[PDB]
Design a protein around this ligand. Structure first.
Ligand SMILES: OC[C@@H]1NC[C@H](O)[C@H]1O
Length: 502
């Protein structure tokens, strides 16, 4: 009933959108180049969320050909109307705006319904048995009516608002309250200028008048300059079960030199919204890591195990691949291990490697996995990658050398630099566990064999940040295998993956 910590969904979880279905809440984030796409969460209190799935789970729903951290799936919106859930988003590397739908969030969602109106950040609003679509073609928020089952546009597109004048007017959502249509948007860009603004009109098609108190949420001003949270925006308003009001939004946690490696994460703010008043977010349009505020009655949910095993023969919804995966290269062994089949595709090829990953969700964490490389030719490797983009990743691996010898290697890829930090000979026998630790300043790398941990050294976090590397994503920690020999049939078994955040 009182108190929570932000972010409510840590790590790479941007552009949150939320809907209420009775006493259940469902939330979606953008996923860019990763498959499956559009993680789907469930909560009873808005504070604790369980990843129950992903909306885009089949290749036919999600073409990721040549997708990267600056493309693929952009902001999604989720809405619930008359027993049907709708997830509407843009595939920027593919065919653009579309939705998928289902009567059961945990099931396989529909095939894509492709939509006519352009721009990005498509969103839906329902009234009087009609479905209204907004999006932002040419930097104008445009409104139309659609049949959401067929994708047919039923009225012409009308321009309605283009914000208060801030850059990149986007993330439009319509709500109706107290006889007003409210249009909530983001301005200022998704970096340090991010801000939430709002306007209203008696008519859905305008004219919209901006809140004299805009912006309603931002850390861009003097009031936010000292905050460890920055870039607050891309919000979605939602009603509490007790009649209170809330917004979910994106933001990020800054690091020395103005860097962020954990991506844009999902945050929660209380909203005062009296009858016939404009909404006010958390008194002064800011948020904090510790939120000492009343809440809906709190119910804890299932989270990431500290030791994930592969005995059930299914990866959880949290695991993600690069672009569309070669599904045959991920298999489960008789004795319940994850088996990755090698291909020659490296982590710098801008194509899908045999690679499967979990989002890093804490500044301070330790991740590890045992690695059993088998049937390997010389230079074949398997291990863990701290991965931001195809040109920006740190690789820790067991490599097959000549004469049945092996070694542990540590390779940093940063644009034109491919830097071998360490190459250390392994003992002929002994199961190797690879270990990656971090704090806000460094990644630390090591390996454990025969009960002894060896330090391989450290590398700066900043070179993998969004500010350095570009794109719209966060660091993921990936298990991978790459072959680099004649006709290799190499594979590697991973018995578990350990992750613990401080
Ligand atoms: O986070 C990806 C895009 N950034 C701005 C826009 O609102 C989003 O779709």
């Amino acid at each position: 009933h009182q108190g929570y910590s932000n972010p409510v969904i840590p790590g790479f979880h941007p552009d949150p959108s939320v809907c209420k279905a009775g006493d259940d809440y469902y939330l979606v984030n953008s996923s860019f180049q990763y498959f499956p796409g559009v993680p789907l969460f469930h909560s009873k209190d808005l504070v604790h969320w369980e990843q129950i799935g992903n909306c885009l789970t089949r290749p036919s729903q999600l073409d990721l050909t040549n997708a990267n951290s600056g493309s693929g799936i952009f902001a999604p919106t989720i809405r619930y109307n008359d027993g049907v859930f709708y997830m509407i988003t843009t595939n920027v590397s593919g065919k653009g705006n579309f939705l998928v739908h289902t009567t059961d969030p945990r099931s396989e969602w529909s095939e894509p319904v492709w939509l006519e109106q352009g721009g990005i950040d498509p969103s839906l609003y329902f009234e009087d048995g009609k479905c209204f679509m907004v999006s932002n073609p040419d930097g104008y928020i445009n409104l139309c009516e659609i049949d959401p089952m067929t994708g047919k546009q039923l009225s012409s597109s009308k321009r309605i608002w283009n914000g208060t004048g801030g850059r990149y007017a986007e993330g439009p959502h319509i709500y109706k309250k107290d006889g007003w249509y409210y249009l909530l948007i983001s301005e200022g860009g998704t970096e340090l200028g991010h801000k939430v603004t709002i306007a209203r009109s008696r008519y859905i098609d305008g004219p919209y008048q901006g809140n004299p108190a805009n912006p309603i949420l931002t850390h861009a001003n003097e009031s936010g300059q000292s905050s460890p949270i920055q870039g607050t925006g891309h919000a979605d308003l939602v009603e509490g079960t007790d009649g209170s009001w809330w917004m979910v939004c994106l933001a990020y946690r800054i690091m020395p030199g103005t860097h962020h490696t954990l991506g844009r994460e999902t945050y929660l703010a209380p909203v005062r919204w009296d009858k016939d008043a404009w909404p006010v977010v958390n008194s002064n349009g800011t948020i904090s890591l510790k939120m000492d505020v009343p809440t809906l009655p709190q119910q804890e949910m299932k989270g990431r195990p500290e030791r994930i095993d592969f005995k059930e023969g299914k990866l959880s919804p949290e695991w993600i691949h690069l672009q569309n995966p070669e599904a045959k290269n991920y298999i489960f062994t008789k004795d319940g291990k994850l088996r990755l089949i090698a291909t020659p595709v490296t982590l710098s090829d801008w194509k899908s490697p045999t690679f499967v990953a979990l989002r890093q969700e804490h500044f301070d964490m330790e991740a590890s996995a045992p690695v059993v490389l088998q049937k390997a030719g010389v230079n074949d490797e398997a291990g863990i990658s701290v991965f931001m983009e195809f040109h920006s990743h740190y690789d820790l691996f067991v490599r097959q050398d000549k004469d049945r010898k092996r070694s542990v290697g540590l390779r940093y890829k940063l644009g034109e630099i491919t830097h071998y930090a360490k190459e250390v000979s392994l003992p002929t026998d002994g199961e190797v566990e690879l270990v990656v630790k971090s704090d806000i300043n460094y990644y630390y790398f090591g390996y454990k064999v025969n009960g002894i941990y060896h330090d391989l050294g450290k590398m700066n976090t900043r070179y993998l940040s969004t500010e350095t590397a570009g794109g719209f994503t966060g660091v993921v920690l990936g298990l991978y295998i790459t072959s680099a020999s004649k006709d290799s049939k190499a594979y590697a078994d991973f018995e578990y993956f350990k992750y613990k955040g401080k």
